[PDB]
Design a protein around this ligand. Sequence first.
Ligand SMILES: Nc1ncnc2cc(-c3cccc(S(=O)(=O)NC(=O)[C@@H]4CCCN4)c3)cc(F)c12
Ligand SMILES: Nc1ncnc2cc(-c3cccc(S(=O)(=O)NC(=O)[C@@H]4CCCN4)c3)cc(F)c12
Lengths: 572, 568
Amino acid sequence: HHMRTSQYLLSTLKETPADAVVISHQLLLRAGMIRRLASGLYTWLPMGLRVLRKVETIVREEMNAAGALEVLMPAVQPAELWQESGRWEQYGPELLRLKDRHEREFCVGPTHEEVITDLARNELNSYKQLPINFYQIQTKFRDEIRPRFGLMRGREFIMKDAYSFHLSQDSLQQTYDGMYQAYSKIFSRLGLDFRPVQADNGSIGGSGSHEFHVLANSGEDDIVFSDSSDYAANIEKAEAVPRESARGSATEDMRLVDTPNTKTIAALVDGFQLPIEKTIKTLVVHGAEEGTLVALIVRGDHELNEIKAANQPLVASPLVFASEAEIRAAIGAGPGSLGPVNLPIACIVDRSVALMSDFAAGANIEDKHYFGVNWERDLPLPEVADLRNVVEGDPSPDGKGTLVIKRGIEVGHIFQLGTKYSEAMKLSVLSEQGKPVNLIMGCYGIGVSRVVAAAIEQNHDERGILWPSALAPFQIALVPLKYETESVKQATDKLYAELTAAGFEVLLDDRDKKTSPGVKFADMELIGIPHRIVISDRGLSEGVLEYKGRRDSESQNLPIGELMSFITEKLS
Amino acid sequence: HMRTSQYLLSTPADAVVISHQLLLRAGMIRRLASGLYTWLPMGLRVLRKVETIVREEMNAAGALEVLMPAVQPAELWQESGRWEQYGPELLRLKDRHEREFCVGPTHEEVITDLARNELNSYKQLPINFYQIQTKFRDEIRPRFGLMRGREFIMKDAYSFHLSQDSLQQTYDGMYQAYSKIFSRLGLDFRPVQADNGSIGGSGSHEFHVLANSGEDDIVFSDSSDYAANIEKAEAVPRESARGSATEDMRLVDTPNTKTIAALVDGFQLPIEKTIKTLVVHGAEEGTLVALIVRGDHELNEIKAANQPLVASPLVFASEAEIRAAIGAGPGSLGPVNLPIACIVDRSVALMSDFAAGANIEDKHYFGVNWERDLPLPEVADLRNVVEGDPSPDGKGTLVIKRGIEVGHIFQLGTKYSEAMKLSVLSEQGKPVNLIMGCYGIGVSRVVAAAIEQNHDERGILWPSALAPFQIALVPLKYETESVKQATDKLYAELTAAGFEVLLDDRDKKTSPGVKFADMELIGIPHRIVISDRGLSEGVLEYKGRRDSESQNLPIGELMSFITEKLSR
Ligand SMILES: Nc1ncnc2cc(-c3cccc(S(=O)(=O)NC(=O)[C@@H]4CCCN4)c3)cc(F)c12
Ligand SMILES: Nc1ncnc2cc(-c3cccc(S(=O)(=O)NC(=O)[C@@H]4CCCN4)c3)cc(F)c12
């Protein structure tokens, strides 16, 4: 019973290299860890499954230590539950819907809030049972429009999803903080450089959601940190405050200027030799009040934050931009020619805009701008709000330090749900005093298969994968030279048995001479095995084995009599 | 602490079999919809214990664990032909791009696709891949709780070989691994021969948990190793010779005589002197074949289909087809003046002076004798065995038992590799279509099967390997500080020594009687009761799940005592 390369290192051919463009995808294919079945659907090959199980074990251990109870819920779920929550329609096209042979309707679960709520309303009948936290490690399906980046944006993927139930907000906060702490322990034990960040929870301010990110150059998410405080937020959530302390004095009188073929900030800047920080962008969106429009204004060098925009009560959520036809009907001028002066719709300006002076804006007259605009003198200041994305070097909104923007891969997300589900689905328990209480809920998700890829995105070199110690699929590769020779065979097999008996996970390279030593060595490093031992006649003659670490440049001789001492020391 | 206030969800017209009843009542599972169940905390613990044992034995047999997707592209199923052929149990769907998929009921096509990409050298063979993975089968009437669900957990393995001998070695290894699995799960089980789709041969076996509720009949020789499911079990006659003709054949009017019972009762004939004639579709398009068994016997539809002359799968001729071919209807058929091909059962060949429908409506021949009145047709084994029949290997007699199928193994030949073009060059450079086996265990079914076999009036009896916890701590008044500290200490010591402990932490509103009944329902094999009185006398109160009476252990020797009980 040896684990052998002839079995574990399968063919990686009929893989078009154009098809893998991020390093984790390339290396998971080349290392024989995953194989594509179809768009966003991958098999875990024997080597890759070993890594997945190590992630799952650590996640389960830390969920258990935090007092959560493991369950396992079905993938296929009745549409009727999804209609109770409203997500049957609202979830959108990522929900995979189907019908069974009796014409009954179902989805494949992308997540399990409705199922666990249905469970709770049947299983939780007393306050003495609360608080409680249920979790599973289970395969989800989300019909991502363009599955890509290997495991990072698959359609079928493994999630640890937990759901907690409470009679009060304070109770929820306690579990939520416990889940945050458990996540920190998980990503620490997985040997990943990671950060928790504040995330959007569907309103201005507050702290009802956090994300956990693996730091990596390829990460799709912008995450924001103070260089001096513990402030940390994804860019959707990060609060923007102005660099300026006050509004500058007006130095220019307002004038109406002809600006043909001037429909972008760049054209205005280049065309009229304006600093970009003296220009504004006026974006028109649908109002929450049906049939109304709202103008949202940011400085010309800033971007509208669509989450912040939507979260304004006056602005419809989700965010909908006005069409050119709607804008022209409302204002009598088109995109490129809009601004706050003589604007016949409501307006909200960014904090930085409120402090601008002598600024340029579309005149709400086609192909004209006002220059030298000043608040109060030329028009009243409208409502002010935080509307923009932060940018590198902005002030930290807690007043401590300046902001830096890094890239992250989202591997965890936790949420406070209040009574969103318990109200919709009638989940209530009587308090100790005998009052009906709609249960207050949290939910907590880790992208378990994503974590595997994220680890590689963060940890790789020119020779292939670098695993954190907790993730390596094997600890030791034995590379016998001439394993067919009786002396090498028996010494190699003896070494395998001694190491395995000490609890080490060992892979034996049993491949014949058509695989050169050089290829074998490169294979073991590509897969990311942290240690190798080479066995040869020459070494045995001198009573040595040849050792090399994955992160060592040179091999070293290992006296056979110090095997366990030497190797135990390396694996600590 | 693992505590009852969290775990215990112990508390139904749809629940008719005992395992289903008890899994609900013990808070192990909860129904979401038809054939869809959630594993509750206590139940999941049992499932994981099954999975661990299965994984251990698969790994020891040299199989490599993988994990394949549930959603599978239709194109692979079209290659094998099972996109259509699997039938309505295949759950078919379309994604947002209108591409077609199924949810996997099994994974032959996916693993074959993997193999044609991953296996390119004879040096890689033989190889055996397996997964423990949730399947979906759209069972027309999901029932029996976990036994016939729609979503269920299967361990499925698939082996690849360059020769039949190589397959046989792995197949035998899987058979042996299965034996170890069900032995370690503490189940009383038997392996049996199963249908392979031809007469004779040994390319399929099933593993059954013996249980009174078992849907499957399985057959054993009392004196030999012979073991087969009823589909597969070979039938041989009890008689050694055909009797001499003592009666002349004669045509008899027999109105309202369309069953064996009407003929036996109506005309006072022994049932062993009557025959049933069943008309089925021939393999040759548009033809019919008559299959004949003795009146006390039943046609085995697997044996019938496996006859080369008979279309497979088996299709029975309609009344209209029968009337058109023969000129009489069901109830009036037989082998005399029969204008279609006929095959008779081994037992029928030995009959004499027998009665048969005349192939004339409402008439029978009596006094029929082979050779004299008509030629003997082809003879075959067509009937089901019955209790007390001769063992077909000549050694002993057969007994029939009821089984729950929990495992099934198959030799597939090149069925998939030919259709999907899976081939590897031999050492000689000749392309070889890979010869395949597959091996399945119904992991979630096993949990229910265990209870079907092992239960009593107080609830579940788990095999030691399956029990969700080893010890229940039942403090009588846990609010009492002396009790709380002693119990908590006990929990810590026990847990520290590696034992799995449930602490009943529930308040006074739950009587000690209910606590005891709950721990027995859920099947925990050992309890320790902690009372202040007991602690004052330096004694704890122990009881095994299968014991009649509790006993008083000295508070000091509990650890040695418990350790011994759990060291077997
Ligand atoms: N395509 C994809 N491929 C691979 N891994 C993916 C992982 C996620 C993922 C992971 C963690 C949390 C979330 S979430 O933020 O959506 N939150 C919830 O689902 C909540 C918490 C748990 C109960 N419901 C999504 C999403 C994807 F799309 C993936
Ligand atoms: N409804 C149901 N509920 C719960 N458990 C069920 C279990 C099975 C089951 C178990 C073992 C083998 C088989 S099989 O004989 O079909 N063989 C194959 O699938 C082969 C071997 C493995 C690769 N393919 C079916 C079938 C069901 F329908 C179930």
